Design a protein around this nucleic acid. Structure first.
Lengths: 101, 189, 314, 66, 139, 139, 225
RNA sequence: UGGUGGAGCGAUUUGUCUGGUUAAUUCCGAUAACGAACGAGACUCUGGCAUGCUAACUAGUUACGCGACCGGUCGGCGUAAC
């Protein structure tokens, strides 16, 4: 029951905000002590490569960005309740990692 | 009251010609403690007219490749120069600066109308802003150039240049170039 | 005999003066809201050089603060803003005491109960919100509340059955009961969206005005039409004189002061002597407030100026 | 320079001749009613329409717009 | 009893904490006169000379500076001090006194209250800087 | 009066003079010969540089705690000029920083931290704050 | 030991990409439209969207549990952690890839380029697309490379909307003379609140609700409740 | 750049324009054309503002306690309002 934390990590913002909000309101209605979403610095993966395969042109470059948005929600609740509240909330395009102490 | 480097007053300074009276800023409402303002005075047209003339001097001082963004050093060059000026002549340096810019500004320039290779120029009038621009540019190039490879420093070279320029001495680079530009306008007409 | 004269013009706010609020307790203190997201408290020095001086400015209401009102004691203040939240201010120090966070869209009007224990607030939500003192939402009415926006909501100050009045942009002036929240009257006279509804100082007459520019008088005791007062342009504000027994509305560039036994033109307030900005449209009068003693009128204009109109008796 | 495109013009016009009685002279009221009136794609587009609606509502009193 | 505001230039940020006291002036625990770029010492003395020490009498301000470069920090701290004073003379004094301060500060230099918004522009491929391009050789 | 209240240039010269006068600072055998970094072209001009470096090191360790040999090597770094190759940031000498910290440990002015770094001792804080006292007194 | 979030999200990207490339080269003949992968620590499910599922399953669901044994043997996750599901495509007309594959396998049937491409246009416009663009390039006739573009309805080229309003497919057809390039571009319908097409409208579109005819009252009357 | 209409046996042309106006075939207004479609614009990402909102021992401040050194300095440590 002690200090389970839940790390929600995704590339989409909307889906991550929706699922995390659902976990929070799902926990709040049960009268459980919850520490709110801790938004960490957004990880931006940059790749800059030549457009051309051959290498004859005006030396143009692509700029490929990949965004990683990470949220932490913390609970002071029993593991039995934590298991089912973590079980019910599934979404394609979010990764959830639960840790205790 | 407000005094330049907290030791030079801006009330005892006096403008000669009415033409430049609204194109040399140094006066009651433009009185600043340091040249260094970091304003947006080159944002649009006729905004640099409201730039303090001391700031225009120290900005046009950091010109050549090695000193492009080395303002903090031009401010102390101008500070030392102003002290040298006061020691040599006796009176307010800001008056000497204004006198130098008043004298140094070319009144009639020559414009290119024709083809390239051949020289054919029409003599035309110079705007009060362009007079101030060329005056500052000529003073700095004279200072710079004069002290490039010899022992006297930039500070006392700038002082010497402004002493000569203010009292219209033939030795000043700025006076020689003005004289030549007006003589070329006189040659065309 | 009794004509209005411009005594001075307080200049503080930097935007449209949306609402002015006064109290009988403090006669040297008025509280005016504006479109610079600021509510300024005035010290009425009544000097020759200027009538008032900016004293304290409440800040933090993000978007335009539309309505402002203060309690019976000169200690609290309530406001409703376009950010969609109400703020209850501590007037002494000038800090927010409580935040009501319920509405969705822009809050247009708020009202303070006579006993100072109940709050009613109208928005663009198509709903009225009943808040209590501590600040939790009590009752959100959605039983055909309004088809369009709710422009003005007010209380009826009397010892009789306490009732609230609510006009909207659906042409309806609707009357609710607190603790019951059912309709007694839905009045249908106007032809145009409504801006203001004001109750009498006694608490017997209701005055509704808007785009139509024809102020219509009802009676709360029966629920029937009495008069149709024919105004000029759009009515921005109605207010009853607490002593003189007059009705003062707001035409766009002028303020009309009228008698209720004569039904005649008593006065016309227009301040335009210079013709420098005569090519442009005149500056609109938005807010109307009365002084403590009911001898003076406070007019809020869209040119960022609050004017005082002193009744010069002979 | 900045010229209002056929999109904001067309939209603004049909808004006037549908909800003339709803609109007035103030930009912010027209901006707020334009949200409720039309399903509009973005804030900028709504601001530009609200602005040109304001501009038309000025000159409608001056004379009859074609 | 106290207020806390930030002055910002480029990526420099200087947060001034203003409380009541004996006219104390400290930035990162150091006096103004002991700040490293002494050439621009007057730029820090701008707000205190313009208003006069008498206004600072009943005010202790503690400034902390982070990010940016030397001169940017100087513009952040000198902005922060003035914004802190006007914020304090807004909250715990009449608005008239705040106006009497504001008008003087704005009339001298608008930079003291309003932040310079421009930032270091993004660099593009095909050149060394944001505008400049590499040398283009014909034959 | 505190180290932060005085000028940080004069303070080092005063503390260096104190460290010389004490006459119990273990100077290495190679002070006359060795440079002070990878990127310096000549040996330092002043004969008593070890005392000024020791003084500087103590002052740095006063201003923030938990400073190792690597940090001290990062403090006294500068611009390596590589002839025709462009100039890059080069770090200081590790030995000089280590011998200075060893020599100051010798005075019981600095001691090792449980966390891993080196902090100034209350004896050190006394000496440094005293030196600041008379440096302030000399104006 | 576990890998970083950055490397993990990349790894999932390559997994998706390689799986797609494998599935395309396997189920091209059965009009493989797309794939959807949902991952659960209990067991990860792979969902294949193809034109004719009856075929991709195989004789009594034989081929599906060849494909299952492949991905299990290859990627190295444990057996009983994957079930390859084959769901039917909602509308095969508004899938660029499906139409591109159909055009490729009817061209391999030895049909004229004009009739084949027009057949695909007619079907895509019949299915209910906003507009279609079919391009075929290479040795169409003779020894010189040529290109034939065929367009119908509305087709947008610039801005963000292109990303989520038009879907494209690029396919290589092997002929005896050489190789032909098929480019199929389909603009979808508004489809509010649906799976067919995008939810948000185009950002240059302004929809205005019709006013209700309000009867203006002349005589004042007050209805009592 | 089509559709239908107009002008030429025809290739073709008009629409797609005299004149103002815009960064813009961008608009206004003329009008044998009228209705449209792509590009432009809209759009998406990024900079600049919020002492308003939701939050935070993997971010900090303010206050208090204890300590080190002379009411002051601390990126010396531990709790509470945010």
């Amino acid at each position: 029951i002690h200090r389970i934390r839940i790390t929600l990590t995704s590339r989409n913002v909307k889906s991550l905000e929706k699922v995390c909000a659902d976990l929070i309101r799902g926990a709040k209605e049960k009268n459980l002590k919850v520490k709110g979403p801790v938004r960490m610095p957004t990880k931006t993966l940059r790749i800059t490569t030549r457009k051309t395969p051959c290498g004859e042109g005006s030396k143009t470059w692509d700029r490929f960005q990949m965004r990683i948005h990470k949220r932490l929600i913390d609970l002071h609740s029993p593991s039995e309740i934590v298991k089912q509240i973590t079980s019910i909330s599934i979404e394609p395009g979010v990764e959830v990692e639960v840790t205790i102490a | 009251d407000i005094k330049l480097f907290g030791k030079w007053s801006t009330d005892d300074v006096q403008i000669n010609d009415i033409s430049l009276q609204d194109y040399i800023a140094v006066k009651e409402k433009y009185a600043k403690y340091l040249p260094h303002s970091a304003g947006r005075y080159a944002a649009k047209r006729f905004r640099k007219a409201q730039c303090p003339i001391v700031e225009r001097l120290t900005n046009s001082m950091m010109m050549h490749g090695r000193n492009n963004g080395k303002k903090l050093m031009t401010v102390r060059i101008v500070k030392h120069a102003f002290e040298i000026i006061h020691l040599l002549t006796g009176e307010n340096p800001l008056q000497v600066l204004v006198n130098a810019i008043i004298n140094s500004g070319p009144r009639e320039d020559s414009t290119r109308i024709g083809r390239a290779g051949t020289v054919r120029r029409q003599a035309v009038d110079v705007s009060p802003l362009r007079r101030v621009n060329q005056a500052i540019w000529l003073l700095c190039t004279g200072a710079r150039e004069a002290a490039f490879r010899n022992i006297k420093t930039i500070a006392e070279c700038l002082a010497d240049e402004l002493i000569n320029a203010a009292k219209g001495s033939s030795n000043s680079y700025a006076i020689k170039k003005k004289d030549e530009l007006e003589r070329v306008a006189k040659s065309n007409r | 005999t009794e004509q209005m004269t411009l005594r001075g013009t307080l200049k503080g706010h930097n935007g449209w003066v949306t609402q002015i609020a006064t109290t009988p307790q403090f006669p040297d203190m008025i509280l005016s809201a504006s479109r610079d997201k600021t509510i300024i408290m005035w010290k009425l020095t009544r000097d020759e050089t200027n009538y008032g001086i900016p004293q304290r400015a409440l800040r933090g209401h993000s978007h335009f603060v539309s309505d402002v009102v203060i309690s019976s004691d000169g200690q609290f203040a309530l406001s409703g803003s376009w950010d969609g939240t109400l703020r209850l201010w501590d007037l002494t120090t000038g800090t927010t005491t409580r935040r009501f966070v319920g509405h969705t869209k822009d809050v247009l009007s708020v009202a303070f109960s006579s006993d100072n224990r109940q709050i009613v607030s109208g928005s663009r939500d198509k709903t009225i919100k009943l808040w209590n003192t501590l600040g939790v939402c009590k009752y959100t009415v959605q039983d055909e509340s309004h088809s369009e926006w709710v422009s003005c909501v007010r209380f009826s100050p009397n010892s009789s059955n306490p009732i609230i009045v609510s006009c909207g942009w659906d042409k309806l002036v609707k009357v609710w009961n607190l603790a019951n929240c059912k309709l007694k009257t839905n009045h249908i006279g106007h032809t145009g969206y409504l801006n203001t509804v004001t109750v009498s100082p006694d608490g017997s007459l209701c005055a509704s005005g808007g785009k139509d520019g024809q102020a219509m008088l009802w009676d709360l005791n029966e629920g029937k039409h009495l008069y149709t007062l024919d105004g000029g342009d759009i009515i921005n504000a109605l207010c009853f004189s607490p002593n003189r027994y007059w009705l003062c509305a707001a035409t766009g560039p002028s303020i009309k002061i009228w008698d209720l036994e004569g039904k005649i033109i008593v006065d016309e307030l227009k301040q335009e002597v210079i013709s420098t900005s005569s090519k442009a449209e005149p500056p609109q009068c938005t807010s109307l407030a009365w002084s403590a003693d009911g001898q003076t009128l406070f007019a809020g204009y869209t040119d960022n100026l609050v004017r005082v109109w002193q009744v010069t008796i002979g | 320079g900045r010229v209002r495109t056929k999109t904001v013009k067309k939209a603004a016009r049909v808004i006037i001749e549908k909800y003339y009685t709803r609109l007035g002279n103030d930009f912010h009221t027209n901006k707020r009613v334009c949200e409720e009136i039309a399903i509009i794609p973005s804030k900028k587009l709504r601001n530009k329409i609200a602005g040109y609606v304001t501009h038309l509502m000025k000159r409608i009193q001056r004379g009859p717009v074609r | 009893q106290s207020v806390q505001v930030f002055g910002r230039k480029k990526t420099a940020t200087a947060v001034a904490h203003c409380k009541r006291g004996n006219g104390l002036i400290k930035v990162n625990g150091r006096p103004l006169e002991m700040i490293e770029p002494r050439t621009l010492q007057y730029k820090l003395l701008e707000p205190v000379l313009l208003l006069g020490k008498e206004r600072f009498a009943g005010v202790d301000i503690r400034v902390r500076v982070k990010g940016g470069g030397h001169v940017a920090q100087i513009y952040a701290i000198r902005q922060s001090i003035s914004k802190a004073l006007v914020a304090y003379y807004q909250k715990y004094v009449d608005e008239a006194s705040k106006k009497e301060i504001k008008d003087i500060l704005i009339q001298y230099d608008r930079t003291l209250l309003v932040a310079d918004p421009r930032r270091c522009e993004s660099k593009k491929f095909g050149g060394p800087g944001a505008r400049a391009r590499y040398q283009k050789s014909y034959r | 009066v505190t180290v932060k209240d005085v000028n940080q240039q004069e303070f080092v010269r005063a503390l260096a003079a104190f460290l010389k006068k004490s006459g119990k600072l273990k100077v290495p055998e190679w002070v006359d010969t060795v440079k002070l970094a990878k990127h310096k072209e000549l040996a330092p001009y002043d004969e008593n540089w070890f005392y000024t470096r020791a003084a500087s090191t103590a002052r740095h360790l006063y201003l923030r705690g938990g400073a190792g040999v690597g940090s001290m090597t990062k403090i006294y770094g500068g611009r390596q000029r590589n002839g025709v190759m462009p100039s890059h940031f080069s770090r200081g000498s590790k030995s000089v920083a280590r011998r200075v910290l060893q020599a100051l440990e010798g005075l019981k002015m600095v001691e090792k931290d449980q966390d891993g770094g080196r902090k100034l001792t209350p004896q050190g804080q006394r000496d440094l704050d005293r030196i600041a006292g008379q440096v302030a007194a000399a104006n | 030991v576990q890998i970083s979030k950055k490397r993990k999200f990349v790894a999932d990207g390559i997994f998706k990409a390689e799986l797609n490339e494998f599935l395309t080269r396997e189920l091209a003949e059965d009009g493989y439209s797309g794939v959807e992968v949902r991952v659960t620590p209990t067991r990860t499910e792979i969902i294949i969207l193809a034109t004719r599922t009856q075929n991709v399953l195989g004789e009594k669901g034989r081929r599906i549990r060849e494909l299952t044994a492949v991905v299990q043997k290859r990627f190295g996750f444990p057996e009983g952690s994957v079930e390859l599901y084959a769901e039917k495509v909602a509308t095969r007309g508004l899938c660029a890839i499906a139409q591109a594959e159909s055009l490729r396998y009817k061209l391999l049937g030895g049909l004229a380029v004009r009739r084949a491409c027009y057949g695909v246009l007619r079907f895509i416009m019949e299915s209910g697309a906003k507009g279609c663009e079919v391009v075929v390039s290479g040795k169409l006739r003779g020894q010189r490379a040529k290109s034939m573009k065929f367009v119908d309805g509305l087709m947008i080229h610039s801005g963000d909307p292109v990303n989520y309003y038009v879907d494209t497919a690029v396919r290589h057809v092997l002929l005896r003379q050489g190789v032909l390039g098929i480019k199929v571009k389909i603009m979808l319908p508004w489809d509010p609140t649906g799976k067919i097409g995008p939810k948000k409208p185009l950002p240059d579109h302004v929809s205005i609700v019709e006013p209700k005819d309000e009867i203006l009252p002349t005589t004042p009357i007050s209805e009592q409740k």
